[PDB]
């Protein structure tokens, strides 16, 4: 399935700051967010403009009475475009058990015993057998924000990598145009520094540095 966001780089932590702090009326939800991902040693998905990633992740807010394990999904998203603040990427996600995806980062290999459609769907589309040949290259650390503002869902994000931390708005939308705009117009108007967002979270941890 195609899957659209506005994907817009806030400039500096101030502006992030700025922005966290005028939207919290506005505030649904906080995601803690640990981000992995999966190729083999000569970049074989990477060149298929392929990325396989496992997300964990914990609400901020979950109950303290009731605790539940966090949540491990699997994403694949192929045939990537990201231009003028706006991506769109073919994507297919599928929830799993904690405790496998965790074992699956420490051996890949056992990617195969999830019986999974998404990771079915790696093995047809790219012509593997089976993950026997497959790295776990890491990844990193993401916050955030969720919010209901204007009839949509702005989702603020403060990705911690090794060398340093990098911040973006996000909105996921099949009416991009037109929710960029607004977005744009929001932030103009209360002065928080913006660009486009020209790179993935996952191509800035591969770059090793600050876009
Ligand atoms: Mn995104």
Redesign the pocket.
């Known amino acids: 399935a195609m899957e659209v966001?506005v994907?817009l780089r806030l400039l500096t932590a101030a502006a992030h700051l700025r922005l966290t702090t005028l939207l919290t009326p506005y505030h649904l939800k906080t995601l803690h967010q640990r981000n992995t991902f999966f190729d083999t040693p000569k970049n074989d998905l990477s060149l298929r403009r392929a990325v396989l990633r496992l997300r964990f992740l914990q609400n901020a807010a979950v109950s303290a009475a009731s605790p539940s394990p966090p949540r491990c999904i699997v994403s694949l998203k192929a045939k990537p475009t990201l231009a003028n603040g706006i991506?769109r990427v073919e994507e297919d996600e599928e929830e799993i058990e904690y405790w496998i995806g965790k074992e699956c980062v420490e051996s890949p290999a056992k990617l195969s015993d999830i019986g999974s459609r998404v990771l079915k769907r790696v093995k047809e589309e790219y012509g593997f057998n089976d993950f026997l040949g497959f790295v776990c290259l890491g990844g990193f650390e993401n916050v955030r924000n969720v919010y209901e503002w204007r009839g949509v869902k702005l989702?603020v994000?403060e990705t911690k990598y090794d060398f340093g931390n990098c911040y973006?708005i996000?909105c996921?939308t099949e009416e991009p145009e037109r929710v960029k705009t607004m977005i744009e117009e929001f932030l103009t108007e209360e002065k928080i520094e913006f660009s486009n967002s020209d790179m993935?979270?996952f191509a800035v941890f591969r770059s090793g540095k600050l876009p």
Do not use: A, I, L, V
């Open positions: 966001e994907k991506s989702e994000d973006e996000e996921e993935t979270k």
